Design a protein around this ligand. Structure first.
Ligand SMILES: [Mg+2]
Ligand SMILES: [Mg+2]
Ligand SMILES: [Mg+2]
Lengths: 63, 177, 49, 40, 46, 282
RNA sequence: UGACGGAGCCAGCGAGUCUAACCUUGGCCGAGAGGUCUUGGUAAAAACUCCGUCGUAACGAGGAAUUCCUAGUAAGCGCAAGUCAUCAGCUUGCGUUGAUUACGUCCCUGCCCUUCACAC
């Protein structure tokens, strides 16, 4: 890996974030990027619920 | 564990949830068993018994009923016979209903038998390779009738009543002490 | 007993085994557990010796 | 309901970026915690 | 995720409560105790 | 040997017992030394102890890595055997190879019907320094135990987020140079003990320009393990992951070889204590 | 290099007063709680050796590519335990039967190292 790494850098001046399958007849996804998004969306939803726990009013915008 | 939940999807929500038994043994919900539905696996700090009941402590919200019945005695004709919502006790009597009860919930006197545990059984492999100082003397039972065992005369009658009594007295004395 | 009502020092009665589970036997409480644990630890200690 | 233990941490992209930065800083400073041959 | 949030919140709440409880216990001991010693010294002087 | 190993362990345990008894006396001598330099008076108990004062004249003449490792710390390169549980799946066999490439001085051994007392005794004959056993679940590594010979400790770990290198396309081959080590956020006394165990699996004295770095980062008791290869650029450092990635959480640590199930427990993970969630030991 | 049946025969781990179903049909006693009986359905050492009999929609041993492996190893067989993490869609131990082929070479592919006599 390193010898390729020097080769790339001298021309210019992390393959573990991609899950790849076997071509039976290739990159399949993004575990790091997908999990971050799926984890944050439930975080803002959890943030929303804790705001809504103890409220009855709310600005009723019908515009 | 069984009968806590109804389907594996329910167990999914409560994985890792804290649990305990009646005895006080704490535990955790590990994972949901694929078969049968609802059954799950839990690991307890010490071995639990079948007779135990495993309990999960949860909290369910309760809401305050919005009931407002101002007393307006002056508007009435009598002014001293205002009557609003009746008590649960009175309501049941008017409808001829029993106070709900659960046979499980009632209390009863509990009598505990003295607890006793079996004697210790050393594995034979360990027992074989023991130092000479500490070798456990396990005296095997005899099955072939010994000749002396077929010879000895046991006094009957007057001695028998006079010997059972000795085993009677000494049993009282040790228990007294 | 200083500044304590006799109502505070009220006996809390102990529950019993459910009838649906009556076959299995007596419901183990904390006291009867402690006896089970102590005896087991006493025996294992001798084996380790 | 109560939970007994923290769930095992998840490896997000932000976590890797934080972990990478620590390693890069250590190498750049050239301090590593490694066993050193004893003299004599 | 809900498990992760709850334990962090519970631990933080437990941390603040102990600091607050220690805070009130210590300030009472420090200030009030000083006066009690001051009074006792005056009683000894009398 | 068997008589040799038994007596050596007995003396060592006896040395620990006396050292714990000697701990009080050591402090008593430290107080006397400070009193002489400062001129401060001694406490009452030390003043009336004539035996200590007479002993002090001889014991005035007195002055790190852990005891099991102190003998060979930085002298003799570790010898490592990496094995698995019985009838391993292919993935565990693949992962066991990756661990072998991780440690420069490791060798992979097949556990087909090897009995554990035979396995440890065989390794003790051959001078093996460390034995590593990996378990698996449906081709997913789950546990890792590191057993230092001749007399422990045995440290047990559980793996999460395991990502083997075979899961990568066109990864290439690894570099087997003696790699640099990074140990981050190990603070408590137990944490040093784990650093002490993990540090000594590697060969001492990497070259300053060695291009392989292994990092064990503790983050809430979950030791992240990463392997990187770096190229020093004119304006910083650029790194690339070689792998494998995985997270280790200690859950046992015994004063003995992994065979001895009766060995004393130096530390264990208590999960059902009420206050389990609050503190992180490592 | 089968099936069925019978016969002979060989292990090692493991010992918490602790070990383990569900859904029904009815009878009797009991103020109740419940107790007992009755009743149908559903679930839940092996290899080895000897003897006797028969008889040779999907799929019939798995393409390309890719991975692992050197002696009690590969592979086949069952038996236990579930030991604060992991595991029962399974994990870990235990014994039983036990081979072929290499144990040389730096030719290719990678990684690494180097540039106190006598004799050289
Ligand atoms: Mg095999
Ligand atoms: Mg098998
Ligand atoms: Mg297995």
């Amino acid at each position: 890996q390193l010898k390729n790494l020097k080769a790339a850098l001298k021309a210019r001046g992390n393959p573990f974030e991609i899950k790849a399958a076997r071509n039976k007849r290739i990159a399949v996804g993004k575990p790091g990027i997908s999990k971050q998004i799926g984890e944050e969306q439930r975080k803002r939803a959890f943030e929303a619920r804790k705001m809504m726990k103890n409220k009855r009013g709310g600005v009723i915008d019908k515009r | 564990i069984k009968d806590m939940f109804s389907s594996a999807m329910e167990v999914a929500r409560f994985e890792g949830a804290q649990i305990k038994t009646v005895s006080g043994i704490r535990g955790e919900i590990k994972r949901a068993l694929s078969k049968p539905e609802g059954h799950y696996r839990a690991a307890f700090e010490d071995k639990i018994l079948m007779s135990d009941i495993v309990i999960l402590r949860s909290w369910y919200p309760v809401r305050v009923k919005k009931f407002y019945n101002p007393v307006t005695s002056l508007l009435l004709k009598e002014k001293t016979e205002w009557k609003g919502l009746r008590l649960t006790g009175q309501i049941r009597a008017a409808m001829n209903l029993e106070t709900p009860s659960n046979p499980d919930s009632a209390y009863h006197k509990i009598e505990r038998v003295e607890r006793h545990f079996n004697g210790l059984k050393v594995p034979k492999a360990v027992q074989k390779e023991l130092p000479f100082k500490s070798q456990i003397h396990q005296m095997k039972p005899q099955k072939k009738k010994t000749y002396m065992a077929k010879r000895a005369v046991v006094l009957g009658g007057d001695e028998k009543k006079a010997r059972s009594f000795i085993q009677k007295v000494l049993t009282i004395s040790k228990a007294k002490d | 007993a200083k500044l304590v009502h006799d109502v505070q020092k009220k006996q809390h009665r102990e529950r019993s085994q459910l009838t649906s589970r009556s076959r299995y036997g007596f419901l183990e409480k904390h006291k009867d557990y402690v006896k089970r644990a102590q005896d087991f630890h006493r025996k294992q200690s001798t084996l380790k010796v | 309901f109560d939970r007994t233990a923290k769930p095992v941490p998840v490896i997000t992209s932000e976590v890797t970026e934080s972990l990478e930065d620590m390693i890069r800083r250590r190498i750049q400073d050239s301090n590593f915690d490694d066993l050193q041959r004893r003299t004599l | 995720f809900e498990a992760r949030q709850r334990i962090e919140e519970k631990n933080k709440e437990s941390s603040d409560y102990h600091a607050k409880m220690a805070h009130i216990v210590n300030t009472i001991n420090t200030e009030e105790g000083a006066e009690k010693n001051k009074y006792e010294r005056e009683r000894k002087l009398r | 040997m068997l008589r040799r190993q038994a007596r050596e362990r007995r003396e060592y345990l006896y040395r620990k017992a006396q050292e714990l008894q000697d701990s009080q006396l050591q402090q008593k001598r430290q107080i006397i030394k400070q009193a002489l330099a400062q001129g401060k008076p001694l406490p009452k108990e030390l003043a009336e102890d004539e035996s200590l004062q007479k002993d002090f004249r001889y014991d005035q003449s007195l002055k790190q890595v852990d005891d099991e490792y102190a003998a060979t710390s930085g002298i003799m390169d570790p010898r490592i055997i990496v094995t698995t549980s019985r009838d391993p799946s292919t993935r565990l066999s693949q992962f066991a190879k990756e661990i072998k490439l991780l440690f420069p001085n490791a060798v992979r051994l097949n556990r087909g019907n090897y009995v554990m007392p035979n396995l440890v005794d065989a390794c003790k004959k051959s001078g093996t320094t460390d034995l590593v056993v990996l378990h698996e679940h449906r081709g997913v590594p789950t546990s890792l135990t590191i057993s230092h010979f001749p007399h422990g400790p045995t440290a047990q770990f559980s793996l999460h987020n395991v990502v083997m290198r075979h899961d990568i396309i066109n990864a290439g081959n690894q570099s087997e140079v003696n790699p640099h080590l990074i140990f981050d956020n190990f603070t408590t006394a137990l944490g040093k003990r784990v650093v002490c165990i993990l540090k000594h699996l590697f060969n001492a004295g990497p070259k300053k320009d060695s291009e392989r770095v292994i990092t064990f980062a503790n983050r809430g008791d979950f030791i992240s393990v990463r392997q990187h290869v770096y190229v020093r650029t004119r304006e910083g450092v650029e790194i690339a992951e070689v792998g494998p990635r995985f997270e280790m959480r200690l859950f046992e640590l015994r004063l003995g070889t992994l065979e001895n199930k009766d060995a004393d427990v130096e530390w264990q993970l208590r999960r059902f204590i009420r206050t389990a969630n609050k503190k992180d030991y490592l």
